[PDB]
Structure formats: structure tokens, C-alpha cells
Ligand binder design. Structure first.
Ligand SMILES: O=C(CCCOc1cccc(Br)c1)N[C@H]1CCSC1=O
Ligand SMILES: O=C(CCCOc1cccc(Br)c1)N[C@H]1CCSC1=O
Lengths: 241, 298, 238, 298
DNA sequence: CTGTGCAGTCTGGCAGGT
DNA sequence: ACCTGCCAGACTGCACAG
């Protein structure tokens, strides 16, 4: 097993260093240490929810200058960003280019203005369906093709362990509308998602129509919703069914 | 070519001064900035500074000197140039600073270096060791040497008490000094050197492996390296240390005495390194090495 | 330089000129046999049909054991696939993990699948993929587990992307094609609101929104808008 | 004792016979069932038989002969002892069997065998190579030698196009032959020996390494190995093959032709081989080896 | 291509018990 | 925890005019 060493040895070492840390700022601090050691100035870990369909909120932490974070949270460049949306298209890492952000150029002009010109971003869909992205950035020295695969594997290991522990530490970042449907309400919401109306679901369950109606009311108030389409869509999105 | 061994320019912002077997490495940090690396031995002083005048308009543009080791290999040049340079921070490991502060160690280092001189030269005026312009560095300290230089110091213990290694993050360069050992001039494979601890040495090489793939591996003996071998230099030195462990343990089990292997290994290796290290101390040094190997790591 | 990075670059290069599924699984078979384990498998839990989540699968096991899945349909009951739904780490095969459904473990031990691993991963288009590997002896040590983790996660990434390129029948869900306005109106109504409120905010009459709703109804073969919204959320296409 | 070398009661169920350098191993796999392994060289036949009568009460009791590959150094004893062992049965890979059935690559074998016969030694009556009893065995076939031992055949190619190794799960020994390659007793480290395919050889060693921790290890030269060297013997072969590849590519970069390296390896390493290899042919063996490594490495 | 249609099944929301 | 009827509400698969 001590034959290749190398990258596997790095992964074991980073896991050992990461494990006993329990403060989230400590986790980001060690990640910041690691991404400095690869030769990139700055990093940024972002999480795209899918809770609000019309305006999907995207919660982000990282180390870019604070007024640029303010530029995000005021002008709301998160949704218009295609680096985040690349995860929805495919699970490929993507280096940054002027060609890549042809859809939205104001972001690129602001970034190249503001001390970020070279960088890359690795998406990943967390198991709970919250598309997450890990971005890294520097000023000069465009990424070489010789470099790219090592950054790819190391960023994937980093984001895997990172989202694992951020799930473990129940960060504000990933907490959804916390809902815990037990078995029968999970089943009935699932069946409603399958489009069977109340009568069909009732007769196959042989349960009274107004009883299942009241169960729909319980599910309604649980999500604070006016219509079952919200219940079905959100239950599908968050994986409750 | 792989061992970019000649003096002069090596890479866009890296030059080799003096003799390759005990190099004195120089970094172009900017427009009016310089920074020596890896130090040197005492005999080469009038050589090394005489090469510095070729690559530097005037000596004041130096700002930082990186030193990686306690031994005579690389501390020897320090007192004989620091009066010339108006200012330079001798960045070195925290435990090495106490080594310079002590009066005991300087006796060994200065006498050993003075043994290496040619029959003619006497050194120029040089300040006492205690007045060195020194600033310690701990593990992981981010040496912002310049706009284009973000070096991380890693404490690679085991080859000595204190041996640190400097790693440029941006170009994936790494000045390891003697931590990787000594790159063999002829036969190519790495050559282990452990003189004060064994168990820590493998830990240091593990951390060196944990650093990402290395474009340019740089020991303190034999000049710069590039390419495939420099990438897995960290793995190969670890593996060679295990190979020498196997050699010593097999010989001990076979019952041949300890020093006979030391004499044979001295005969094998000392020839390429004769010009900085008289053989009588070479034998004792590698005797100590094999003593540590026999003691530890069965 | 040898080693892992040069084992990943060469594998990607060997993967690039392929244009058929048999070549993909052939190189998977060669590489997993290089790794050490005997058999492989690639499963896909789709989330599309909610009442009966259909599971596709392809590998090299006994053909009759694949037939055992088709006759008895242990796709839903498999904990190995189900761990992908909850978490993302690799799960190592053991009696404790299958303790919920020991019948599967009993047949698996009987059919000579004693030891293995099973890495899940969420495919980019919201559709659970998993790649598993197995052998007959040599229970996985903690020393080999992480090497298995890295390799079984470089091949599942590349292979899921690769079959997504070849439009393999396993990965792709039913074809979906929505206009920007169709997607937009379905996204707006996916949040629970009456069609009238939608008509007010879009500044278009109720007839048009009902018309587009009827179009999505005919597209998804739906009996109710809830089905359309649910499948839309599941496929990640709004 | 880490390497049991002399012949005799090597173990409770095993006994080495013949010269230690090119040995034949007897397996005491039952009160009424023994077996042979690694069928050696032709010249030692009248030794081996003279040794075998120390153990066997009657030679007919022997059943199974195990053979590793088609090279002359391990298959010399078959035509000289197989007719006189009437109940013998020879096991080997099918690619060995095709080679033996072929007229070609046999006259060379008997010539090289003859070419080692210390002085006037007419051999005994020899049968033709095709007629002797063989039942070839494929990869992974479980072998019911007897109630106790259940060996396993692993398709360990690379030292030759037909090489296989024989593993037992019960007591965790492994008749390697030359899959790992020769063992250097003087230097205590393994010897690479590749003659067809590097790329198959390394993955064969990986398949060897993934086996359990070996309690014992029997290469085709140097006798049985015991203890710590049994475990990481798989790892050390991998190590040494990459080491010698590094040496070849390094000297090629320097500019030395392979001919210098072949002479260097010969003078450094032929001391073990002087008894049972022509020196001139050993040089050609290193030439073929290093040419194959030059082609296939990186 | 899209506004307007009543007719009509689908179904939020307690009233009142189980 | 899971039960049986109503009162309109918010619409449902086609309607064909705009
Ligand atoms: O996608 C990402 C990661 C998510 C956003 O990162 C940010 C942005 C502002 C403040 C902080 Br802290 C992090 N970065 C890329 C998109 C545009 S440029 C860039 O850095
Ligand atoms: O589905 C899996 C992993 C892949 C199994 O391989 C196959 C083989 C044929 C059809 C299917 Br579906 C899967 N289950 C695991 C846990 C219990 S047994 C096993 O292999």
C-alpha cells in the first residue's frame, strides 16, 4: 500500500488534519491554508439552494474582499452567474475565460477590475440536492493544462470532505426548511406527487377521503403553503419523497 | 536537460552562483529586489560574491536570505558576506537561531569550514555570529518575499534537528537542501542522509510528498532538477531510506559487522562529494548515519 | 512521473476516443481488474416515477443474479443504493449495513459476492448514480479503503460523464423540451399560486396561462398540475 | 535466521534439494503424497536424484511436479527424471506447454543446459520433451494436491510471456520463481528480471502484492525466505523495477548508451550468476532487459 | 397564434364527532 | 392519532372567437 504514496498520502493527511477541528471558521481556515499551498490566492465555497424557485438563494462564504461580497448581496449576481449554473449543466470542472462568461459580461468586468482574473470552479451536487461549488482564484499566471488535473482532483477531495463536515456541523448554509415527515405523510405526499387525486389515493389506501384531506392540511401547514403543487414540488426538490 | 547544472541563469527568475556542488541560489523578486537562497560554504566566498556582482547591479538590492540547514554545508557563507550587504534578513528555522547563538556550534562549523580552504586564500573581515541580521521562521509561515513569491516554510526535521525547506507555491518550486538527501551525480537515484533522527525524517518526507506535484525540485547539492523525477522526488527519497534500512538490517542479520558496511558505502559514495567534505569526517558521518539506522526502524 | 496523477491523465486520454458503451465497460473491467477486485457494477436510481422508482443497472455479475433483481425487484430495497440518497461517502459492504434486509445479504453471500465497496454520486442532472465493485475474499482493510475511495471516485465521475455523452439509455430520462416562457410559467406556478395571481404578475390573461398549462399537461401526460410540478422539480429542469 | 539456505528439513512439510542457487523444492503434502516444485537445471540431475533418495521411501510415491516457466534455468530436470518417476505429473501454464510441444525453443534449451555441465558429465537417459506427461493449468485454478495444501495459480506474467506463481492460502507461502526476480544476498534487496513486458510485469507484481501478508516466500533462487522479508517482498520488487528504470532513463538523459550500463550491471551483479549462467549470455540478458525497459518506461 | 365560455369535476377549509 | 359531511373556491379538458 506504500507503493504509490503521493496523492493518497496527501488525502489521508488532510483528513487527519481536518477531522478534530469542530469550529467552522477553523474548517475554512485550514481550507484557506490548503488553497494557498496550491498557489492560488483566494477561494470561495458557495451553495445554491433550490428552495425558492423564482429567485434561488445562493449562500456563500469565502475570502474575497468584503465590498465585493457586498456587490453580490446587493446587485444579486448569484443567479445571473453561469459558473454556478455550470454545475446544473454538467459535473465538469471549468477554468475561467472571457469566452465562458459571454452571457454575463458585467460580472467579468467587475472581477477583472477587482483583483480576480484567473481562476476555476468545481461544482458538485450534495446528496441532499443543494448544488455546491468551490471556486479558487489568483491574479497572474493563467492556469496551465499541465496543472489542471491536480487542481481538479484536489478540489474534488476538498469539496467532498468540506460538504461532509458542513453537513455534520449543521451550518446555516445548508439547513433547508427543516421538515421531518414520518412514514405515512411521506407516502401520501409521494402519492400526491404521482398525480393521483384524493379519491384514487384514498381507495387504494382504503382510507377516508376527509382523513387524507386533513393529512394534506397538516402537510400544507408544515411547509406553510397555499396549494399542493408547492408541497409536491418542494418535496421532490428536497428529497423528502 | 534535467539537471540544469551550469552556473548563471536557470529559469526566468532564478540564477545559480558559485560552484554547483554547494550552490548559492538567487531569486529575482522584482525590479530592484533580490534574495539569496540556500547559503554556502566558507571557501567559495570570493567566488560567490564575485558572481553576485554579475547578476546584481549593486548588493543593496538584496532583501532576504533563506537558510535551510544548521551544518557547515550552507551556514559557512553567512558571516563572510553580511558585512558587505547593507541589509538582509537571514530567514532561518527557529531552532537554528539558537544554534547560531551558541558558542559551541560555531567552533565546529568554523573549524570544519577552515579545513576546506585552498592553500592560498584567507577569508575577509567577518562579523561575529551573534550579530547576524536574523529573523526566525516557524512552521507554515508565509514568506511574502515579493509580489511574485509566496513561499511556505515547512520544518523537515530528521536530517538535522532543524532542517526547514522552502516551497514556492506559485511556480511549484521547492528548495529542500539536504532533506531529500543528496542527488547522485552519476547513477541518478536519490541518496539518503539522516544524521540526528530517523522516525522524524520519514514524517518530513511524508509532508514533502503531501505538497503537490513539484515542477522543480532543488536540493542543496547538485543543482536544480526538473521533470518527472523531480515530481516524485519526495516519494523516491522515502523509498531509498527504506532501501538503506533493508540493506543495513539484512547485513546485520547476516552478521557482518557495522563499520564494514560503512567503509564500503564510503568507498561507493564519497568520490563525487570529495570536494567539500574530507573523507576522514565522511567516514565518521556515515558511521553515525548507520548507527541511527541500526538503532531505529526495524 | 508515474503514480496517481499520471494514472488519471492517461485514463482520461484513453477514455476520450471511445464512442461506444462496450468500450467504456471494457476499459472499466480492465481498470477494476487492475485495481484488484473481481466484479464491477454501475447502478442508476432514477427519481422520476415516485411510486416505483425505476432502477437501471449494468455490470459483470452472474446473469441469473441480475435476473434475481428483475424477478424480485430489490432496487428499492437495496441499502447500497439507498445510502446515496442520504449521504455521499463510500459505504463498505458488511453485515451491519445490510442488517435492514438480511435476505439480500444471504443471497449475496450464497452467490459469491462476499466483499466489496459501493460509491454513490449525484449525477449533474439530478439522478443518483452508483458504482460498486466486489471480490470473494480479502475483507477491505482500512489501509486499502481510501485508495479504493479515490480510484472508485475518479472512474465513476468520468464514466457517468462519458455515458452521458453517448446518450446511453440508462442515464437519460424521458426527453424534456420546454420553451423559456414554458419553463418560466411552470417555475412560477411551481411555487404554489393560483393561475389568476400568475396572470396578474406576468401581465397576460388567464387564458394564456391555462393554455400553457395544458401544453405542459400534454407534455408530461399528467392528470393534475401537481404531477407536472413534481416531475419538473425532480428532473431539475425549471 | 531470515533466509534458510542449506538443504534438508526446511520445514515441517517442505524440504529443499540440490544446490541452493538453483534449487528444487519437495512438498511433503501427505503420508502417501509428495510433490516437486521449480524443476531446476539439467546438470544437477544425478545430484537431485541422489538427494531425493534420502527422503522418498519409494520414488513412485511422488505425484506432482510444479514448474514456473519455460526458461532453461527452472525446467532442466524433467526429461532426465520424469521417465524414472513413472507417476509424475507436470503442472504449468498452457503457454509453457505450447513452448515445450514446439520443436523450436527446445534445442536452445538443451544447448544452454548442456552448456553448463561442469566437466565430463554425460547425463542419464533423456526422453523427448513432447511425450512427457503434462496437464496444463489456467489462471486462478484451485489445485487439490492433497487434503492439507490447496495451492492457487496466479497468472503472474512479465518475467516471461508464460510465467505463473503458486500461492497457498493455508500457510501463506508463495513459490515465486522469477516473478519477483532474483534475490541479492550480498545487498539484501531484490533483483528485477524482465525479459518480455514491463507493463505486464508491474501489474503482475501489484496482483502479487494484493495477496495477504505472506508468511513465507520461495523464489527460484536463494531458497526459502522467512519473516519480515516475506511480507514486503512484493513491494520491494515493484520498488527495484522502478529504481532500475530510473537509472536507465537517467543515464540515457546523461548520454551514456545502454552498453555502458550493461557492463556496469554485469560487473556489479554477476557474482551470484557465475555458477549457473554463462557470463557472456548474462550480458546479453541485461541488454535485452534494458532495451525492453527503455522502450516501455517513461 | 391567443382572449372568453359556461359547464363541471377538483378540492381549500371547519362543523362536528371518533 | 386518524375520523365523515358540506360550502363554495379555484379551477378542468374543450369550447371556438379574436
Ligand atoms: O462562483 C464563484 C463562487 C461563488 C461566489 O464567490 C464569492 C463571491 C463574492 C464573495 C465571496 Br466571500 C465569494 N466565484 C466566481 C463567479 C464569478 S467570479 C468568481 O470568483
Ligand atoms: O446493486 C447493488 C450493487 C451492484 C450489483 O451489481 C448488479 C448486478 C446486476 C444487476 C444490478 Br441492478 C446490479 N447491490 C449490491 C448490495 C447488495 S448486493 C450488491 O452487489
Amino acid at each position: 500500500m506504500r507503493n504509490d504514496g503521493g496523492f493518497l498520502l496527501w488525502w489521508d493527511g488532510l483528513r487527519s488534519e481536518m477531522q478534530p477541528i469542530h469550529d467552522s471558521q477553523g474548517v475554512f481556515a485550514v481550507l484557506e491554508k490548503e488553497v494557498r499551498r496550491l498557489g492560488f490566492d483566494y477561494y470561495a465555497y458557495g451553495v445554491r439552494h433550490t428552495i425558492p424557485f423564482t429567485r434561488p438563494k445562493t449562500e456563500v462564504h469565502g475570502t474575497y474582499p468584503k465590498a465585493w461580497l457586498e456587490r453580490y448581496q446587493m446587485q444579486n449576481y448569484g443567479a445571473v452567474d453561469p459558473a454556478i449554473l455550470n454545475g446544473l449543466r454538467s459535473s465538469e470542472m471549468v477554468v475561467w475565460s472571457d469566452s465562458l462568461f459571454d452571457q454575463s459580461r458585467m460580472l467579468w468586468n467587475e472581477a477583472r477590475d477587482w483583483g480576480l482574473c484567473v481562476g476555476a470552479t468545481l461544482p458538485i451536487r450534495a446528496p441532499n440536492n443543494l448544488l455546491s461549488v468551490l471556486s479558487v482564484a489568483r491574479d497572474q499566471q493563467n492556469i496551465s493544462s499541465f496543472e489542471r488535473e491536480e487542481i481538479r482532483l484536489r478540489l474534488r477531495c476538498m469539496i467532498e470532505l468540506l460538504t461532509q463536515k458542513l453537513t455534520d456541523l449543521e451550518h446555516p448554509m445548508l439547513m433547508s426548511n427543516p421538515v421531518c415527515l414520518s412514514h405515512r405523510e411521506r407516502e401520501i405526499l409521494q402519492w400526491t406527487a404521482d398525480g393521483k387525486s384524493s379519491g384514487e389515493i384514498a381507495i387504494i389506501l382504503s382510507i377516508s377521503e376527509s382523513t387524507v384531506n386533513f393529512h394534506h392540511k397538516n402537510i400544507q401547514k408544515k411547509f406553510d403553503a397555499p396549494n399542493k403543487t408547492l408541497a409536491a414540488a418542494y418535496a421532490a426538490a428536497l428529497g423528502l419523497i | 536537460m534535467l539537471r540544469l547544472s551550469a552556473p548563471g541563469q536557470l529559469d526566468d527568475d532564478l540564477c545559480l552562483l558559485g560552484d554547483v556542488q554547494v550552490p548559492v541560489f538567487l531569486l529575482r523578486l522584482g525590479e530592484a529586489s533580490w534574495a539569496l537562497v540556500e547559503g554556502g560554504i566558507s571557501r567559495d566566498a570570493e567566488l560567490v560574491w564575485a558572481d553576485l556582482c554579475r547578476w546584481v547591479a549593486d548588493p543593496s538590492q538584496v532583501h532576504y536570505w533563506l537558510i535551510t540547514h544548521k551544518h557547515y554545508d550552507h551556514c559557512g557563507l553567512l558571516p563572510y558576506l553580511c558585512p558587505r550587504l547593507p541589509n538582509v534578513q537571514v530567514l532561518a528555522s527557529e531552532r537554528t537561531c539558537q544554534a547560531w547563538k551558541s558558542e559551541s556550534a560555531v567552533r565546529v562549523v568554523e573549524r570544519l569550514n577552515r579545513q576546506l580552504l585552498r592553500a592560498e586564500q584567507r577569508l575577509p573581515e567577518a562579523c561575529a555570529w551573534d550579530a547576524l541580521p536574523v529573523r526566525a521562521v516557524a512552521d507554515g509561515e508565509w514568506l511574502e518575499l515579493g509580489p511574485r513569491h509566496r513561499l511556505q516554510v515547512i520544518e523537515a526535521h530528521g536530517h538535522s534537528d532543524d532542517h526547514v525547506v522552502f516551497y514556492d507555491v506559485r511556480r511549484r518550486r521547492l528548495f529542500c537542501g539536504d532533506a531529500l538527501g543528496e542527488f547522485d551525480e552519476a547513477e541518478g537515484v536519490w541518496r539518503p542522509l539522516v544524521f540526528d533522527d530517523m522516525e522524524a525524517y520519514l514524517e518530513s518526507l511524508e509532508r514533502l510528498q503531501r505538497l503537490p506535484t513539484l515542477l522543480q525540485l532543488i536540493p542543496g547539492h547538485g543543482g536544480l532538477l526538473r521533470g518527472r523525477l523531480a515530481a516524485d522526488g519526495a516519494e523516491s527519497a522515502y523509498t531509498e531510506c527504506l532501501r538503506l534500512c533493508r540493506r543495513l538490517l539484512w547485513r546485520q542479520s547476516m552478521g557482518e559487522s557495522l563499520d564494514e558496511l560503512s567503509e564500503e558505502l564510503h568507498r561507493a559514495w564519497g568520490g563525487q562529494s570529495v570536494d567539500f567534505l574530507p573523507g576522514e569526517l565522511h567516514l565518521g558521518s556515515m558511521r553515525r548515519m548507520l548507527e541511527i539506522l541500526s538503532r531505529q526502524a526495524l
